[PDB]
Design a protein around this ligand. Structure first.
Ligand code: ZN
Lengths: 205, 208, 105, 156, 121
RNA sequence: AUGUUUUUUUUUUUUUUGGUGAGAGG
RNA sequence: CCCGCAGAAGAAGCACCGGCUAACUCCGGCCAGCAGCCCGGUAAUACGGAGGGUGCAAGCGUUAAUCGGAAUUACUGGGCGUAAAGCGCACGCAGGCGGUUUGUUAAGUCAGAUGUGAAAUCCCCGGGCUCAACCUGGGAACUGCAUCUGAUACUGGCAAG
């Protein structure tokens, strides 16, 4: 139910930096980010039409840490919902509790955030929510509870975030350690490199 | 084995000889042997130096070698240090007083042998043979060859079934005797086997 | 193209309108590598990307999305001469009178 | 600015006294991400050369296509030889739902959103041609208005 | 084709027969080996392919391929067949590692497909 | 007068487009 | 359901990597074996093992079965000179279709209403289980059938041309 292996390998495979490590130390120093994993890394022949789409899908999934069935479900939901499908999917992905936490800066990585969520550190509207897939709504305040507020990791995460660009769709307080999910993010607010359309196509086989 | 050797057919007309001496039936074989030896030695030595043509010429119990090379600097080394060294060994090989001259080859892309050697080297260091061939052809053309042909043969890309491929550009008349056709050959001793490289470079026609 | 050149005083609203970002930290560059400082004198978000149409840190290495600013880079995405026209502003904690209007004789 | 996609490359033979002479056909298609599209079909003894030729061909004899935003203006059929093709305009987000050669042509054309089925033959060369034809025939609202002697609001 | 014609006599659906009829819409069937033997395949191939004529539970007498390297089967050995045809007249495979048919010896990849338990170390 | 009379894989991918200070000449 | 306790602790496999099809190398002789369709005879990315990778993941493969792809029974939506496909040719009952004008009818057709079309299910907006599945409020839908009141271009009936 989770990917427990090497994180940088995934990144290498993808091509890009997936942000699977905190960002204290640059990704180029930790691993050969350009070279693909395994014995046959240096060889890089152009991929197929299907293959590129698949890769794209993987990238997105990897980024958020969502396994396949769940991803499929999300896609379906997006399709069902009104408006642009890929965009909707992206929004849904964002909405995940762990992701939100990460954005806020209470977790160094998304993985860390997820862990925190699991371990009953986070509350959503003053009620302890344990599910990483929990879809956080507009105007839903989300905070660290008083037990987990003393942790050194949390502050480190916050610091890291502060170095990292702040998302417009949230509003977080470092002292209070509570952030308000103000609105579901627009496509423009998210990263431009993610070809959602490819993903959509893949499932529209 | 269809074709006549392009150098060999033209030795009387437009191409000259490499070994250039007279000898009676007594000493001729020996001389030939000596030439073979010295040439062999030179090839062994000046592999890294781009060497095209060794011209041996022995008058009056004294051997005059003339090395045509693209880069004299690596053959000469420090001024009269490497050449001198070469000389004594040459003498030893011969059993006579030696004299080494070094001709500087202008335009090594137009010298056929050199090109062939380069191609072989490329093959050895695992490039795409075809791309190498193209480079060879293109470069020569750029330099002002009236034409060039190159041919490579056998175990191309380590394939089980051997084949030959060849690229021509411009005009390369072989039947025309008065055509200056610089022909030469080389062999790439790859992991899969030998790959023979031929190259014809047509400088132009001589009028006399 | 243009007539006369007009010179006047600079209002704080006018200086905030010239500007593209507050220069906080005094840290010039990294000095052990090649990267600058985020966010110091020679910033990324306040001014622009060192390389032309490139996020200095890592995204956009072709000519499609000129402008996107990810959180991992905090960088604009324009020309190499774009930083020559862009200027920063330092929020002086304590007011300081100009020396040209205090000692001009 | 122009994007160019090699759809297919196929090895074709000619029998001679000696044996078989092989050659390569390259089908490419190029477009500017707006109305302009053009396919090219190039042939040579080696692949890359053939591809280049195809590209060259494509770059000349382009064709304009009226695009209402990211999608088509109305459902359009296009036929050529075996390949008969249907393509239908679709809502923003849906992506190019189309198969093979057809997809490639659409992508370069700068349609982002289509629902497209290739009936009949799916021989890349024919199908791309069919697609092109379909695109070409497809008229815009303005054009239709012009034709009919009306305003755009009269047609809706 | 003509609508009237269609009305008169509607369109016949192509009834596709099952290529594994001795199963009778069962995922596997139990059977007893009537005889076990090797057979030579058709052109262009060359081998001695191990196969057993099986009398099934439901009454059919079929012939079932035996996959993997080596097998313990004899006459009167109770085996499970699964359907799948080897590319004359063999339309079924013995399930290795079910009933009397053993898993393949010394096999470490695709183990499931030959009944083999996970190697311990 | 006559020819399905010795078949076996001897296999499909490019290239891509800078301040500081000193000295001389006129 | 909540609180406390200890300590990374008790918790990852399955299939695949010739092309289709995401993933490649080395070592073991048309055998042993593989195979869904289209390898193996001594350099096998196709057999078996290894290392490396890819895809799924408390599951993963295989088999069986249904729809899909299959516009490959084509109502939507195919064809028939040569690819399968025009009766050897006619007459002709039933059947199908029917030039043009007016009038009338109102069967078909269309419009509106009424009754019904069980609940659940599906779909939309909500709510409740920490989320989800699940449960659940209200709607929409259930393409229909029947009846009543209109419309009369088209098709039909009847009457005259
Ligand atoms: Zn960037």
């Amino acid at each position: 139910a989770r990917y427990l292996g090497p994180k940088l390998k995934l990144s290498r495979r993808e091509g890009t930096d997936l942000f699977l490590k905190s960002g204290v130390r640059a990704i180029d120093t930790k691993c050969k980010i350009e070279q693909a994993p395994g014995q046959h890394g240096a060889r890089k022949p152009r991929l197929s039409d299907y293959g590129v789409q698949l890769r794209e899908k993987q990238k997105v999934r990897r980024i958020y840490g969502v396994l396949e069935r769940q991803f499929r479900n999300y896609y379906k939901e997006a399709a069902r919902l009104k408006g642009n499908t890929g965009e909707n999917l992206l929004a849904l992905l964002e909405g995940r509790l762990d992701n939100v936490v990460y954005r806020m800066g209470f977790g160094a990585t998304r993985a860390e955030a997820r862990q925190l969520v699991s371990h009953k550190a986070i509350m959503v509207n003053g009620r302890v929510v344990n599910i990483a897939s929990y879809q956080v709504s507009p105007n839903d305040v989300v905070s660290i509870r008083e037990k987990a507020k003393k942790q050194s990791r949390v502050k480190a995460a916050l610091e890291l975030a502060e170095q990292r660009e702040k998302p417009t769709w949230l509003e977080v307080d470092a002292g209070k350690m509570e952030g308000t999910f103000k609105r579901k993010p627009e496509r423009s607010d998210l990263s431009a490199d993610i070809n959602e359309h490819l993903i959509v196509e893949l499932y529209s086989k | 084995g269809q074709k006549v050797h392009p150098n060999g057919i033209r030795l009387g007309i437009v191409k000259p000889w490499n070994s250039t001496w007279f000898a009676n039936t007594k000493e001729f074989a020996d001389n030939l042997d000596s030439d073979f030896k010295v040439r062999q030695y030179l090839t062994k030595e000046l592999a890294k130096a781009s060497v095209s043509r060794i011209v041996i010429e022995r008058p009056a119990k004294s051997i005059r070698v003339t090395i045509h090379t693209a880069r004299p600097g690596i053959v000469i080394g420090k001024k009269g240090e490497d050449v001198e060294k070469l000389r004594k060994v040459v003498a030893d090989i011969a059993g006579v007083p030696a004299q080494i001259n070094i001709a500087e080859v202008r335009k090594p892309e137009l010298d056929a042998k050199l090109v062939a050697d380069s191609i072989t080297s490329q093959l050895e260091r695992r490039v795409m043979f075809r791309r190498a061939m193209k480079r060879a052809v293109q470069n020569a053309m750029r330099l002002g060859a009236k034409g060039i042909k190159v041919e490579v043969s056998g175990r191309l890309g380590g394939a089980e079934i051997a084949r030959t491929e060849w690229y021509r550009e411009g005009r390369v008349p072989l039947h025309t005797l008065r055509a200056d056709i610089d022909y030469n050959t080389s062999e790439a001793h790859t992991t899969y086997g030998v790959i023979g490289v031929k190259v014809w470079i047509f400088k132009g026609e001589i009028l006399g | 193209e243009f007539d006369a050149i007009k010179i006047a005083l600079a209002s704080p609203d006018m200086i905030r309108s010239w500007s593209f970002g507050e220069v906080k930290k005094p840290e010039t560059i990294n000095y052990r590598t090649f990267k600058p400082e985020r966010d110091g004198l020679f910033c990324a978000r306040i001014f622009g990307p060192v390389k032309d149409y490139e996020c200095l840190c890592g995204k956009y290495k072709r000519l499609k999305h000129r402008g996107v600013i990810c959180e991992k880079c905090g960088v604009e995405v324009t020309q190499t001469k774009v930083r020559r026209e862009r200027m920063g502003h330092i929020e002086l904690a304590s007011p300081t009178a100009h020396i040209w209007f205090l000692k001009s004789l | 600015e122009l994007q160019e996609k090699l759809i297919a490359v196929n090895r074709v033979s000619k029998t001679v006294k000696g044996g078989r002479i092989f050659s390569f056909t390259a089908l490419t298609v190029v477009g500017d991400g707006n109305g302009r599209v053009g396919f090219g079909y190039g042939k040579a003894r080696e692949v890359p050369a053939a591809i280049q030729k195809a590209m060259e061909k494509a770059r000349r004899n382009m064709i304009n296509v009226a695009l209402n935003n990211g999608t088509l203006q109305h459902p359009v059929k296009g036929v050529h030889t075996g390949s008969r093709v249907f393509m239908q305009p679709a809502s923003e987000g849906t992506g190019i739902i189309a198969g093979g050669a057809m997809r490639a042509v659409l992508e370069v054309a700068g349609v982002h959103n289509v629902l497209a089925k290739a009936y009949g033959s799916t021989n890349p060369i024919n199908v791309v041609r069919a697609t092109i034809d379909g695109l070409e025939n497809m008229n815009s609202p303005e054009m239709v208005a012009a034709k009919r002697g009306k305003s755009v609001e009269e047609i809706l | 084709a003509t609508v009237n014609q269609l009305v008169r006599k509607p369109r016949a659906r192509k009834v596709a027969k099952s290529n594994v009829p001795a199963l009778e819409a069962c995922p596997q069937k139990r059977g007893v080996c009537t005889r076990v033997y090797t057979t030579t395949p058709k052109k262009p191939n060359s081998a001695l392919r191990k196969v057993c004529r099986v009398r099934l539970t439901n009454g059919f007498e079929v012939t079932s391929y035996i996959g993997g390297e080596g097998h313990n089967l004899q006459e009167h050995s109770v085996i499970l067949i699964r359907g799948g045809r080897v590319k004359p007249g063999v339309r079924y495979h013995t399930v290795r590692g079910a009933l009397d048919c053993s898993g393949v010896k010394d096999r470490k990849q695709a183990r499931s497909k030959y009944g083999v338990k996970r190697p311990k170390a």
